[PDB]
Design a protein around this ligand. Structure first.
Ligand SMILES: OC[C@@H]1[C@@H](O)[C@H](O)[C@@H](O)c2[nH]cc[n+]21
Ligand SMILES: [Ca+2]
Length: 769
């Protein structure tokens, strides 16, 4: 490996060998079908709301999130980079697809598949990833850096449906070597969203953009239809000329054939036919190829950038609504703009690299933090793009000031912005994209007094319940299978209108968003104030014994949606205390004296009774009325965790908080698989895991990272990082279960999981407050 020194990969990048088999992989531990796409994954490409494409560590374009809200795992085999090399003096060269695998059927059988093992590495530090190719039959060593311009405090480039592939080639040998790099792509119009005739009318064209000191050559893969529909648009691949390289291309090869129409050209001398051909296809799948060829002398390095764009302007949801995607603000809505997007990337990628370096540098340059922590901190952010992210720039046929946004809970539970989860998972948005975060919270504010009296069947018990109650915050803002932003509370396993955490978490999120953006946004507090007061006032009505605290009802009426709480719970009780303190402070800021007084009065009574009912001398009891009320809950003081972040001070005595945190580390962490797997949710005082429900026996990745944050703020530095390390290990390490780029909600002691690709573990960013 002589190529590593010619590029700059951070030591904290996650690494794996190209073609590596992983032996320890976890699988779902639930009874009904659940997504398991395997451990062959990678860091995604694509901006927020753009649709994303997961290119795996084996080189394949395999995890398709281009249909917004859906996860489709299938390798499109025509989509590849390939290499040709010939040493000066030899009669033949060699050609090789850079993919550690082969197609299942006979399509593209002429291509040279099965990139060999132990011949290259994959590296990832989101939004960047890299491959190196160090192969005994490839004298010239190659590397690529791939990325999309995902940039904090930037709402423009961050939305773009584009990826850059910056290649570096170096000749460590003593002979001249001719080298070609080829990018192939299938015309994927019709891959989704088209009910019949899926390739019909697809056609490819070549764009040559020549202007002084610039030549770009690109293929634009579109359809002859000018219809404005979810399925229609364009893909483009292309390359920018640099000194010492020539460009060749092939506009049309057949993907549903043996591929020799292309490969016979590339494998001979690494140079394509430059054949333009705009003939549309009928049944056959078609693709395009863009290549560069150059000669490298001994010791010579060259850099060449390729790019990929996709202009699919319209997203359609299952309930029928069609919306334009955010990037259309910058490039247009007609779906004929892929080249413009590609060109912007090829002409500005060096600037984008620097912008990414500039935001990663403060963390990467901090030598007090271990590299493993940096690996997790950056790579967990994959989910902001990969989470079915929807970001609208108008309803088709409809202009407003704001652009609505939604991140999925996950794909198995296809709900936008699940609020009990975003309480944990939204830290990166408030910290890095706060205008999105505040927009999402205003979306929730607007729903507070919505009332939908139609009824739905509650999954857990079969009872009928009202869809949406006035004054109750919704669980979620809908499903991609239905109508995001329009039809809320798609979730139906429990009735969220009686949940005891949503209204308090809503208030805490509002105040968090004010505090963590500088305590300056009075306008945001003003916008949300009526909803805050309404939310707390409605929750107070659920106090059934006048102890000043809402009563959990002996069912799962909060985020642990199969784990029953009854009476005053540590979890919901502490959230309530903190929400009351937050509302007091908002009242002060807004000069609402009567609100300050009322919430102060409720706070003092509730605080006294919380302490009386639950403090047992060592920790706070799970609740006051359950069968295992004395279980040690990992999340027992979630309200105090948020109070620390919001700078609301002590809601409970410092000494008792410290004892409780120490107890949690001693038990829920250290007595669970020797503290190497995170914090199990519920542990009995005898040090055996609580078996009352499956959720008690689960480690929740987002709960554990948030607990680590809590410990860290409280000066329990070793405990904090040790607790978080188990989550990192299970997700990324060779000794873990292979969950990189699909961090799940939960695992059990055997390491098997529930709900991969989950929002909650984005809470690792609470460790950076
Ligand atoms: O894992 C627990 C989570 C809950 O916290 C969410 O509120 C809910 O939408 C849901 N559905 C399935 C699983 N879950
Ligand atoms: Ca009560």
């Amino acid at each position: 490996d002589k190529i590593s020194h010619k590029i700059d990969i951070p030591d904290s990048a996650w690494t794996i060998g190209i073609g590596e088999k992983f032996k320890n992989a976890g699988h779902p531990n639930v009874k009904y079908p659940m997504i398991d796409d395997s451990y062959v994954q990678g860091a995604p490409l694509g901006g927020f709301g753009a649709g994303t494409i997961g290119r795996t560590y084996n080189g394949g374009f395999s995890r398709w999130h281009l249909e917004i809200g859906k996860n489709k795992y299938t390798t499109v085999y025509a989509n590849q980079f390939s290499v040709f090399q010939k040493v000066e003096g030899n009669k033949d060269g060699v050609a090789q697809v850079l993919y550690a695998g082969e197609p299942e059927n006979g399509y593209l059988s002429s291509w040279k598949w099965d990139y060999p093992k132990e011949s290259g590495m994959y590296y990832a530090l989101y939004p960047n990833s890299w491959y190196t190719y160090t192969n005994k039959d490839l004298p010239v060593q190659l590397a690529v850096k791939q990325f999309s311009p995902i940039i904090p405090y930037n709402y423009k480039e961050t939305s773009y449906p584009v990826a850059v592939f910056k290649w570096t080639a170096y000749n460590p040998t003593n002979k001249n070597v001719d080298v070609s790099i080829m990018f192939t792509w299938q015309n994927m119009i019709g891959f989704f969203g088209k009910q019949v005739n899926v390739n019909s009318g697809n056609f490819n064209k070549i764009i040559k953009d020549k202007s002084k000191d610039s030549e770009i050559v690109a293929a634009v893969m579109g359809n002859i239809s000018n219809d404005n529909e979810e399925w229609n648009g364009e893909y483009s691949i292309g390359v920018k000329k640099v000194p010492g390289v020539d460009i060749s291309y092939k506009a049309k090869f057949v993907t549903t054939g043996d591929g020799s129409d292309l490969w016979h050209e590339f494998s001979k001398n690494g140079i394509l036919d430059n054949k333009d051909d705009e003939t549309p296809t009928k049944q056959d799948g078609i693709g395009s190829a863009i290549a560069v060829n150059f000669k490298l002398q001994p010791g010579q390095t060259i850099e060449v950038p390729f790019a990929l764009s996709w202009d699919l302007p319209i997203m359609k949801f299952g309930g029928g609504d069609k919306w334009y995607k955010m990037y259309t603000k910058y490039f247009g809505k007609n779906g004929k703009n892929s080249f413009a997007i590609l060109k912007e990337a090829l002409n500005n990628y060096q600037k984008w690299e620097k912008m990414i370096d500039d935001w990663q540098k403060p963390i990467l340059s901090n030598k007090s933090k271990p590299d493993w922590y940096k690996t997790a901190l950056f790579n967990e952010l994959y989910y902001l793009a990969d989470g079915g992210t929807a970001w609208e720039n108008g309803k088709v046929g409809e202009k407003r000031t704001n652009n609505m946004f939604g991140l999925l809970e996950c794909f198995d539970y296809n709900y936008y912005e699940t609020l009990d989860v975003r309480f944990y998972g939204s830290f990166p948005l408030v910290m890095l994209w706060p205008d999105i975060e505040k927009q999402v919270m205003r979306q929730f504010a607007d729903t507070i007094n919505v009332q939908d009296s139609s009824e739905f069947k509650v999954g857990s018990n079969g009872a009928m319940a009202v869809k949406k109650v006035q004054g109750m915050i919704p669980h979620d803002l809908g499903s991609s299978y239905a109508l995001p932003w329009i039809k809320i509370n798609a979730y139906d396993w429990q009735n969220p209108n009686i949940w005891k955490d949503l209204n308090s978490k809503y208030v805490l999120l509002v105040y968090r968003d004010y505090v963590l953006t500088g305590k300056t946004d009075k306008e945001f507090l003003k916008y949300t104030w009526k909803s805050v007061k309404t939310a707390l006032d409605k929750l107070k009505e659920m106090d059934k014994d006048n102890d000043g605290i809402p009563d959990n009802e002996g069912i799962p009426d909060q985020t642990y949606d199969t784990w029953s709480m009854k009476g005053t719970s540590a979890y919901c009780g502490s959230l309530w205390l903190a929400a009351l303190k937050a509302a007091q402070e908002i009242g002060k800021v807004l000069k609402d004296n009567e609100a300050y007084i009322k919430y102060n009065e409720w706070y003092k009574i509730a605080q006294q009774n919380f302490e009386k009912e639950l403090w047992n001398g060592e920790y706070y009891n799970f609740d006051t009325e359950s069968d295992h009320k004395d279980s040690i809950m990992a999340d027992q003081l979630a309200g105090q965790w948020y109070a620390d972040i919001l700078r609301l001070g002590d809601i409970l005595p410092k000494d008792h908080v410290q004892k409780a945190l120490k107890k949690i580390y001693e038990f829920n962490v250290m007595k669970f698989e020797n503290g190497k797997m995170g914090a199990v949710n519920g542990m009995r005082p005898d040090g055996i895991v609580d078996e009352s429900d499956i959720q008690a026996q689960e480690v929740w990745t987002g709960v554990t990272y948030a607990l680590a944050s809590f410990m860290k703020y409280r000066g329990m530095t070793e405990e904090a990082y040790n607790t978080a390390y188990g989550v990192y290990k299970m997700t990324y390490d060779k000794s873990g279960k292979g969950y990189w780029f699909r961090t799940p909600e939960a695992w059990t002691k055997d390491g098997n999981y529930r709900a991969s690709m989950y929002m909650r573990p984005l809470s690792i960013w609470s460790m950076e407050v």
